Scaffold this active site. Structure first.
Site, short mmCIF file in Angstrom:
data_model
loop_
_atom_site.label_atom_id
_atom_site.label_comp_id
_atom_site.label_asym_id
_atom_site.label_seq_id
_atom_site.Cartn_x
_atom_site.Cartn_y
_atom_site.Cartn_z
N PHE A 216 -0.05 5.65 -4.13
CA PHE A 216 -0.44 5.22 -5.47
C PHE A 216 -1.77 4.45 -5.47
O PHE A 216 -2.42 4.41 -6.52
CB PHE A 216 0.64 4.31 -6.06
CG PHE A 216 0.87 3.03 -5.28
CD1 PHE A 216 0.14 1.88 -5.57
CD2 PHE A 216 1.83 2.96 -4.29
CE1 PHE A 216 0.32 0.72 -4.83
CE2 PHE A 216 2.02 1.78 -3.57
CZ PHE A 216 1.28 0.66 -3.86
N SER B 13 0.84 -1.19 0.00
CA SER B 13 0.00 0.00 0.00
C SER B 13 0.88 1.25 0.00
O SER B 13 2.06 1.18 0.37
CB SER B 13 -0.92 0.01 1.22
OG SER B 13 -0.19 0.31 2.40
N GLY B 14 0.29 2.37 -0.39
CA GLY B 14 0.94 3.68 -0.45
C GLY B 14 0.03 4.72 -1.07
O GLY B 14 -1.17 4.47 -1.26
N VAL C 275 -1.64 -2.96 -3.52
CA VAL C 275 -1.12 -4.09 -4.30
C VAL C 275 -1.65 -5.36 -3.65
O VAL C 275 -1.58 -5.52 -2.43
CB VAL C 275 0.42 -4.16 -4.38
CG1 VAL C 275 0.84 -5.38 -5.22
CG2 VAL C 275 0.97 -2.90 -5.01
N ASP D 84 13.59 6.61 -12.67
CA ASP D 84 13.58 6.59 -11.21
C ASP D 84 14.12 5.28 -10.69
O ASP D 84 13.53 4.63 -9.81
CB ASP D 84 12.16 6.91 -10.68
CG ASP D 84 12.13 7.20 -9.19
OD1 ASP D 84 13.20 7.59 -8.63
OD2 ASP D 84 11.03 7.08 -8.59
C1 LIG Z 1 5.37 -7.36 1.26
C2 LIG Z 1 5.44 -7.88 -0.16
C3 LIG Z 1 5.08 -7.04 -1.21
C4 LIG Z 1 5.16 -7.50 -2.51
N1 LIG Z 1 4.92 -6.89 -3.73
C5 LIG Z 1 5.17 -7.82 -4.69
C6 LIG Z 1 5.07 -7.58 -6.12
N2 LIG Z 1 5.22 -8.59 -6.98
N3 LIG Z 1 5.18 -8.01 -8.22
C7 LIG Z 1 4.99 -6.68 -8.16
C8 LIG Z 1 4.89 -6.35 -6.83
C9 LIG Z 1 4.76 -4.93 -6.32
C10 LIG Z 1 4.35 -3.97 -7.46
C11 LIG Z 1 3.10 -4.25 -8.27
C12 LIG Z 1 4.45 -4.34 -8.92
C13 LIG Z 1 4.83 -3.24 -9.91
C14 LIG Z 1 4.92 -5.74 -9.32
N4 LIG Z 1 5.57 -8.98 -4.20
C15 LIG Z 1 5.55 -8.80 -2.80
C16 LIG Z 1 5.90 -9.66 -1.77
C17 LIG Z 1 5.88 -9.17 -0.46
N5 LIG Z 1 6.38 -10.02 0.59
C18 LIG Z 1 7.80 -9.89 0.92
C19 LIG Z 1 5.60 -10.80 1.38
O1 LIG Z 1 6.05 -11.40 2.34
C20 LIG Z 1 4.13 -10.99 1.00
C21 LIG Z 1 3.24 -10.41 2.10
N6 LIG Z 1 3.84 -12.40 0.63
C22 LIG Z 1 4.78 -12.99 -0.36
C23 LIG Z 1 4.46 -14.44 -0.58
O2 LIG Z 1 3.13 -14.61 -1.03
C24 LIG Z 1 2.24 -14.16 -0.01
C25 LIG Z 1 2.42 -12.70 0.29
#
Ligand SMILES: Cc1cc2[nH]c(-c3n[nH]c4c3C[C@@H]3C[C@]3(C)C4)nc2cc1N(C)C(=O)[C@H](C)N1CCOCC1
Length: 264
Positions: free
Chosen positions: A20, A17-18, A23, A128
């Site tokens: 923007f 979140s933010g 997600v 960026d």
């Molecule tokens: C906090 C987080 C944010 C994440 N944002 C993204 C991400 N993937 N692709 C994009 C985006 C972000 C953006 C949309 C994009 C352009 C492209 N991946 C992410 C994984 C996590 N991590 C570390 C986690 O531990 C999360 C809570 N888990 C992972 C395992 O599955 C269960 C949920």
């Protein structure tokens, strides 16, 4: 096609979140797991983005986060991307601090350099580049994300070089002075990203105001060598920070130089 109908997506868990918007981890019909970014009204020039989305999706490389499509039937719009299991590189570095070998950190820089050399050959400017805009996936692969997206951000405080929020810490002088973007201004940003990686996610120019960063860079100051960066890796970082863009290496040159270091 590039338009994704709302019925082709599910939203499983909010992962980010933010300002923007949000997600979510979700699924995309007949096409597996995805990250879905829901864009808040007024954050982005949506018509400009939708006009370029199809051409943007053809930028495809193993070290670039893939944009799969856009859900635009009703507001708010969503952008559907490749899911990266470990999240942004900035947080990944901070949380795993003390557990990295220098070879792993150099390998993360090489993955980013490989994705940037593809964008440089495609004449696509990131604008960026920073560790916050890199994502970590399967087997700790790093992929570059959000390339060219500042062209659609509606917050003038972030996009104008005189804006209170402008990301001056990653900007070359010609960008912080004139918004003169090029692959060579992305190379300067890549030197700062290399510094973020080798410092294990420290924030560059900590506590310095934007004007103080401009004054410091203009007076020859550069980021200090991180402990985990070798003298040779720090030499390459300083080549990224040459005042004249013409004297900075292209990403194609950096990719050969960094690969020679990693493979020796
Ligand atoms: C906090 C987080 C944010 C994440 N944002 C993204 C991400 N993937 N692709 C994009 C985006 C972000 C953006 C949309 C994009 C352009 C492209 N991946 C992410 C994984 C996590 N991590 C570390 C986690 O531990 C999360 C809570 N888990 C992972 C395992 O599955 C269960 C949920």
């Amino acid at each position: 096609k590039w338009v994704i109908d709302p019925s082709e997506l599910t939203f499983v868990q909010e992962i980010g979140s933010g300002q923007f918007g949000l997600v979510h981890l979700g699924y995309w019909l007949n096409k597996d797991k995805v990250a879905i970014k829901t864009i808040r009204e007024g954050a982005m020039s949506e018509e400009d983005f939708i006009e370029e989305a199809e051409v943007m999706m053809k930028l495809s490389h193993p070290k670039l986060v893939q944009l799969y499509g856009v859900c635009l039937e009703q507001a708010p719009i969503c952008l559907v991307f490749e899911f990266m299991e470990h999240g942004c590189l900035s947080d990944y570095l901070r949380t795993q601090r003390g557990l990295f070998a220098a070879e792993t950190l150099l390998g993360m820089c090489l993955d980013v350099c490989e994705g940037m050399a593809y964008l440089e050959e495609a004449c696509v400017i990131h604008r960026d580049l920073a560790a916050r805009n890199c994502l970590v996936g399967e087997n700790q692969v790093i992929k570059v994300s959000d390339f060219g997206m500042t062209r659609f951000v509606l917050d003038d405080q972030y996009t104008s070089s005189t804006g209170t929020k402008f990301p001056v810490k990653w900007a070359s002088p010609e960008v912080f002075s004139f918004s003169r973007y090029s692959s060579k201004s992305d190379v300067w940003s890549f030197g700062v990203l290399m510094w973020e990686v080798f410092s294990e996610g420290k924030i560059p120019y900590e506590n310095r105001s934007n004007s103080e960063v401009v004054e410091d860079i203009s007076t020859g100051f550069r980021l200090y060598k991180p402990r985990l960066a070798s003298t040779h890796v720090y030499q390459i970082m300083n080549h990224c920070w040459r005042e004249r863009p013409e004297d900075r290496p292209a990403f194609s040159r950096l990719l050969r130089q960094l690969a020679e270091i990693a493979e020796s």
